[PDB]
Paper text:
Several natural systems exhibit ‘facilitated dissociation’, in which an effector (E) can bind to a target–host (TH) complex to form an excited ternary complex (THE)20–26 from which the target dissociates quickly. We set out to design protein systems that undergo facilitated dissociation. We use a switchable target binder (host) and a flexible effector that can rapidly bind to and switch the target–host complex to induce a large steric clash with the target, forming a strained excited ternary complex. We show here that by explicitly considering excited intermediate states when designing coupled protein systems, a broad range of facilitated dissociation systems can be designed.
To allosterically couple binding of the effector to dissociation of the target, we designed structured fusions of the hinge switch and binder such that when the switch is in state X, the target can bind, but when in the effector-bound state Y, it will clash strongly. To measure facilitated dissociation kinetics, we used surface plasmon resonance (SPR): with the target affixed to the SPR surface, we incubated with the host, then measured target–host dissociation under flow of various concentrations of effector. For these four designs, the target dissociates slowly in the absence of the effector; adding the effector increases the rate of dissociation markedly, but minimally affects the target off-rate from a control static binder fusion that lacks an effector-binding site.
Residue numbers in the entry: 2 to 124
């Protein structure tokens, strides 16, 4: 609950930032910062589901940047498809998902094709 409540607080900050942001570069920097805060906070609450924490960090960045996403469940795996990203947003999202996965001890696979980044979170 504490981790889910933290996501909600960071989501409101993410939506207020993009409202007053000066560009996609500033929004991206703030989005990576928010995702790291959530990841480190969730790591301090080991009782919370590690797989779900990674997904919440991804969704926090998706909402902060205002990009389109899709989620599909395959048993224990979760696939996230994020479209419309520029080159800088792809590199930062790849970087942030890798770091967040390592913090949570979760195995994730990342594929980049065109504007589309596909993330698979397992177990």
């Amino acid at each position: 609950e504490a981790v889910r409540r933290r996501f909600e607080e960071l989501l409101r900050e993410a939506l207020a930032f993009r409202e007053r942001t000066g560009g996609r570069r500033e929004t991206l920097e703030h989005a990576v910062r928010l995702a790291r805060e959530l990841a480190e906070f969730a790591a301090s609450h080991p009782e919370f589901n590690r797989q779900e924490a990674v997904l919440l960090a991804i969704e926090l960045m998706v909402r902060a940047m205002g990009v389109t996403m899709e989620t599909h469940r395959s048993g224990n795996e979760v696939k996230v498809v994020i479209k419309g990203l520029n080159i800088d947003e792809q590199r930062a999202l790849y970087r942030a998902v890798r770091e967040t996965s390592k913090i949570m001890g979760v195995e994730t696979e990342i594929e980049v094709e065109g504007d589309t980044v596909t993330i698979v979170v397992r177990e």
